[PDB]
Amino acid sequence: HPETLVKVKDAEDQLGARVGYIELDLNSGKILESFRPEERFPMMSTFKVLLCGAVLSRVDAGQEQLGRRIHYSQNDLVEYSPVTEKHLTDGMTVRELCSAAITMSDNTAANLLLTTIGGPKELTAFLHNMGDHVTRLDRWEPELNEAIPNDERDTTMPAAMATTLRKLLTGELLTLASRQQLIDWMEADKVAGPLLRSALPAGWFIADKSGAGERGSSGIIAALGPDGKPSRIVVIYTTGSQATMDERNRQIAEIGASLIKHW
C-alpha cells in the first residue's frame, strides 16, 4: 500500500540515506510494494540465512551432516562471537553453528560454516544456480560489513533477496525438513527485537534475520503473517546514514508498523 511507501520516504528523510524496500506475497511470489527494489545494499548479517540454506542444501544432498562436529581455535575467533567463544574447547556441530549464526549473528560461526561450503565464492554460485543473479558474497566476517559507498561487494538488491528468501523457505530447493529447519532458526532469532518484532501484533508469526554494518548500514529480511502463519516476505535495507543504530531501528520498526496497519 502506498501509505507504506510514505513511511519509507519519511525514513529516508529521517536517516538522510537510501532505504530499499520490498513487500512480497509468500504464496504466489507477487511483489505487492517496493522502493529502490533494484538498487544494491550491503547484506550484513542477513547473508547468514543464505549461508545456512546452502549448508542445508548440502545436507539434503548428503554432502553434509547437521550433527557433524567442527573444531576451531583462538586463531578463528573474530569480533562478536558470543556463542563460538564459549565452545572453543568443545567445538560445535554444524547445526549448532547455523543456530548461532542465525539466532545470535555469531560472526565466527558464519566463517566456520563459510569454509565448509567453499566460502563466499561457492555461496554466490549457489545463489546464481537457484536463480539469484545479483546477490553476491565476496568477503568474510567482519570485512563483509564495510559498506564502502558504491562497492558492490557483499550486496543484494531488495527484490532479489525477497524472492531468494521465498524460494528457500517455500520453494522446492530444500527438502521440507530443511525448509522447516531454516525457518525455525529464523523464528528463534534473538537479536532483532528492536526491529519488525517491536511492531508485530500479538499472535502473529515472524521468522527474520537482521544486520548492521559500517556507514549507518542496517537491514532485515523476514517472513511474517497473522494467526501464527507467514503469508508475506518483507525486506528492508538502508546504508549511508549518520544515524545511530537505535534511530535506524526505530525507522525500520515504523515501516513495519505501516505494513501491518495496511495489511
From Swiss-Prot:
Miscellaneous: The beta-lactamase present on pBR322 was cloned from plasmid R1 (R7268).
Effect of residue 212 to T: In TEM-5 and TEM-24
Record-listed substrate binding positions: 209-211
Source organism per UniProt: Escherichia coli
Listed name of the protein: Beta-lactamase TEM
Gene: bla
Location of the active site: 45, 143
Entry function: TEM-type are the most prevalent beta-lactamases in enterobacteria; they hydrolyze the beta-lactam bond in susceptible beta-lactam antibiotics, thus conferring resistance to penicillins and cephalosporins. TEM-3 and TEM-4 are capable of hydrolyzing cefotaxime and ceftazidime. TEM-5 is capable of hydrolyzing ceftazidime. TEM-6 is capable of hydrolyzing ceftazidime and aztreonam. TEM-8/CAZ-2, TEM-16/CAZ-7 and TEM-24/CAZ-6 are markedly active against ceftazidime. IRT-4 shows resistance to beta-lactamase inhibitors.
GO biological process, one term: response to antibiotic
The enzyme's E.C. designation: 3.5.2.6
Catalytic activity, reaction form: a beta-lactam + H2O = a substituted beta-amino acid
Keyword Transferase set for record: no
